[PDB]
Amino acid sequence: MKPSEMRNLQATDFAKEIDARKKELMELRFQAAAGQLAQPHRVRQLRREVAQLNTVKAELARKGEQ
RNA sequence: GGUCAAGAUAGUAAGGGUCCACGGUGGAUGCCCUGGCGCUGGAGCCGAUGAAGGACGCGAUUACCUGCGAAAAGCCCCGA
């Protein structure tokens, strides 16, 4: 989610922890339009995760090279 | 009482007038402020690591605005 158990992983996993959510974030987005989205928040969350799932990855891009 | 004659005179308002009562219209007036004006002082550059100012977007529902910008009404960190 954010702690040292987020970065904890592989760069590729970051992607996996990305390209998988936006796979949920889709089926969700579909549901909505199809009517049944009972997890309005899920959306916002899943989303918020992807944010972190990059901000971090991005924090590395400078720590270990400057 | 009456009839006849001669006189005189009022009343009704279709509509109007003045005044009062009560209303409608309309926004003056008074009180108020979520908005302005001036002077004093403070502060005084921004931009190819891409401005100024904008287009299209982001929301469970979003047309206007606001904040942002696909990491999209927000993401990390430090403090409070």
From Swiss-Prot:
<protein>
    <recommendedName>
        <fullName>Large ribosomal subunit protein uL29</fullName>
    </recommendedName>
</protein>
<comment type="function">
    <text>Binds the 23S rRNA. One of the proteins that surrounds the polypeptide exit tunnel on the outside of the subunit.</text>
</comment>
<keyword id="KW-0687">Ribonucleoprotein</keyword>
<dbReference type="InterPro" id="IPR001854">
    <property type="entry name" value="Ribosomal_uL29"/>
</dbReference>
<dbReference type="InterPro" id="IPR050063">
    <property type="entry name" value="Ribosomal_protein_uL29"/>
</dbReference>
<keyword id="KW-0689">Ribosomal protein</keyword>
<comment type="similarity">
    <text>Belongs to the universal ribosomal protein uL29 family.</text>
</comment>
<dbReference type="InterPro" id="IPR018254">
    <property type="entry name" value="Ribosomal_uL29_CS"/>
</dbReference>
<dbReference type="GO" id="GO:0006412">
    <property type="term" value="P:translation"/>
</dbReference>
<comment type="subunit">
    <text>Part of the 50S ribosomal subunit. Contacts protein L23 and trigger factor when it is complexed with the ribosome.</text>
</comment>
<dbReference type="InterPro" id="IPR036049">
    <property type="entry name" value="Ribosomal_uL29_sf"/>
</dbReference>
<dbReference type="GO" id="GO:0022625">
    <property type="term" value="C:cytosolic large ribosomal subunit"/>
</dbReference>
<dbReference type="GO" id="GO:0003735">
    <property type="term" value="F:structural constituent of ribosome"/>
</dbReference>
<keyword id="KW-0694">RNA-binding</keyword>
<dbReference type="Pfam" id="PF00831">
    <property type="entry name" value="Ribosomal_L29"/>
</dbReference>
<keyword id="KW-0699">rRNA-binding</keyword>
<dbReference type="GO" id="GO:0019843">
    <property type="term" value="F:rRNA binding"/>
</dbReference>
